[PDB]
Design a protein around this ligand. Sequence first.
Ligand SMILES: *[C@@H]1[C@H]2C3=C(C)C(=O)C(O)=C2[C@@H]2O[C@H](CC[C@H](C)/C=C(\C)C[C@@H](C)C[C@H](C)[C@]1(O)O3)[C@H](C)[C@H](O)[C@H]2C
Lengths: 233, 140
Amino acid sequence: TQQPIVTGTSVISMKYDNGVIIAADNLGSYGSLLRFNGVERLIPVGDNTVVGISGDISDMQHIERLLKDLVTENAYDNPLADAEEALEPSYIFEYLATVMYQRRSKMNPLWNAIIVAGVQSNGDQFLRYVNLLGVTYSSPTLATGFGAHMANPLLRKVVDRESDIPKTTVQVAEEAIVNAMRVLYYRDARSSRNFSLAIIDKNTGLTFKKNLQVENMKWDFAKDIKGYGTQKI
Amino acid sequence: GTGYDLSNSVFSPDGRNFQVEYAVKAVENGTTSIGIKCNDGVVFAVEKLITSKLLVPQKNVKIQVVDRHIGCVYSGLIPDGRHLVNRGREEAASFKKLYKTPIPIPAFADRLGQYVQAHTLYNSVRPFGVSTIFGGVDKN
Ligand SMILES: *[C@@H]1[C@H]2C3=C(C)C(=O)C(O)=C2[C@@H]2O[C@H](CC[C@H](C)/C=C(\C)C[C@@H](C)C[C@H](C)[C@]1(O)O3)[C@H](C)[C@H](O)[C@H]2C
């Protein structure tokens, strides 16, 4: 029984025709103090999986070290570690989910919302969420914290039910994701301009873009706003 | 009277632990395995006897990885070797957990060294029936 100290805000994600995209900004907040500026919250595991993490950063770092250990351990006495016996996103997910639920059951949670994105060995897209309660769910789009409220509505405009997945391209998914980071930066006081984004594609592999920026920011109209009601200049 | 050899941690009158000496015999009886240090790394190799056509080729791997940067190979009782390696794996995980850096090979050598020594201290255990060649690359 605890309380988050250094925190990461939304992680957002969606699936498209051939894979998944997942994004998260680079801020570690300390309450209202925008304390840390180069925080990576996308964790690549293998070449087929990205784990996006919000909530407590100390706990993030702990999950991070668990994930390194999975890779080490799976490698052991395993001639097929880089082939048929690599880690699948589904395995990494069931592992985290088990851990998260056990830690809520001991009244000592890992204080996070997590999204596992990747592609299964048969090509299938994988997108599933787990949080500090051990609650899990899948949807064509998935977002944590603030993202659930603002990103989902926009991502759901693009992919709205399963049948939209085959119709949606990387260009279009990436556009939608980038757009949502922009909107979240506009209205989430715990968000940053800087973000990482990752595409995991059944043909093109894992693409990991660091140091992205929220683009094309409309602020001009702000000059025509004076007072709070009756003021003229 | 004698019988100094029936029991693991007993000094013979010339100061020897016969049980250890007999464990060496099981090693000597094993497949040959080797290691060569080169000038930026190490190479491990081992002889695997084909008892019969029935053994799937390439499949019964003898060499084992510890952490990400350590190889061990051994001759003697194979299960003993695995047990040594399971311990090595715990031992490197713990070190990495606490100190963040991967275990230096000298550090790692002593961890196996202490554990194997431990198995010459009591008569409730038997010594390891292996010799282990092992190593890898570290910060220096
Ligand atoms: C514009 C979207 C939007 C949201 C959150 C929404 O609810 C909504 O109704 C609109 C409408 O989008 C239309 C095009 C839909 C198409 C699937 C999306 C495209 C071409 C690109 C996305 C990045 C657009 C977002 C989902 C959007 O920014 O959020 C028209 C452009 C309509 O004019 C508009 C009202």
